[PDB]
């Protein structure tokens with residue numbers, strides 16, 4: 225567990241709805257470098273199921289097309305930590321959110337890592353980006369990407 | 383002139399020798415995203431000519447090969463600003479250096495921008511990266527890349 229920042233008292237129900245991946249960062253350049261990189265994902269919506277699991281609707285550029293993807297992150301005993309179903313055990317951690325404006329999360333396996341600043345609106349939230357940068361300084365990131373309001377309103381941020 | 387930070391009293395002679403492109407950033411994701419992106423360049427050496435011009439030896443990934451490139455940046459009336467010979471008028475600005483450890487520079491045309499933290503050794507200089515990040519906050523960057531000591535000792539940082 226490289227990431228040692230989580231949101232205390234996370235109410236997973238209140239993060240439902242629309243988000244924009246305003247920024248992203250990864251421990252490894254190649255995790256995010258090209259449009260088809262395996263962890264370049266854009267979140268459209270989070271749907272917490274009644275059980276306390278979390279469905280994630282996102283867009284990912286695959287075979288020269290912006291593809292929809294639905295994935296479920298299964299709840300654990302820690303309210304801010306969730307398991308995604310890949311080959312290898314993948315954890316999603318919610319580092320921080322104010323529910324109504326911004327949410328910071330990371331995903332790690334077990335050695336490498338990707339994190340995002342999620343925002344509710346197609347706007348550059350300087351304050352949320354500050355928080356994101358501060359959460360990141362204590363992590364070994366090597367690629368950071370940011371998106372403007374025009375790209376935010378486009379499929380796969382083109 | 384988006385960039386309004388320059389090094390006062392720059393002695394261009396004393397920046398000669400070996401440098402490592404430890405970090406890079408650009409106003410536009412696509413300027414740096416893939417290995418063949420037009421401004422993903424790695425500096426090996428700076429040779430200031432007796433006239434006060436600056437020759438730059440660098441590596442750039444082109445047609446599936448790490449290619450050498452020699453370019454000359456022509457001196458202007460400002461000692462920290464140089465003109466490179468492209469189609470459109472290109473300026474190199476030296477923002478800051480202590481000559482012996484680190485050098486921060488940017489290149490801009492005339493709307494978009496790329497900057498680097500150059501270091502003398504194949505080491506992660508936290509202090510120089512602080513300076514680089516601080517010089518950048520006052521700029522509209524959207525992609526940031528960092529390299530580790532292993533990648534630094536490789537052609538084109540592979």
Ligand SMILES: CCCCCCCCCCCCOS(=O)(=O)O
Nearest residue numbers: 265280284293295316318329331
């Ligand atoms: C606050 C919760 C936010 C969590 C969203 C992170 C999910 C991204 C993981 C993609 C899985 C791998 O990509 S996939 O294309 O194969 O599905």
Ligand SMILES: CCCCCCCCCCCCOS(=O)(=O)O
Nearest residue numbers: 423438442451453474476487489
């Ligand atoms: C402190 C001085 C450092 C300046 C180095 C910046 C030069 C990079 C510009 C590449 C030109 C375009 O790329 S090229 O491949 O066509 O040559």
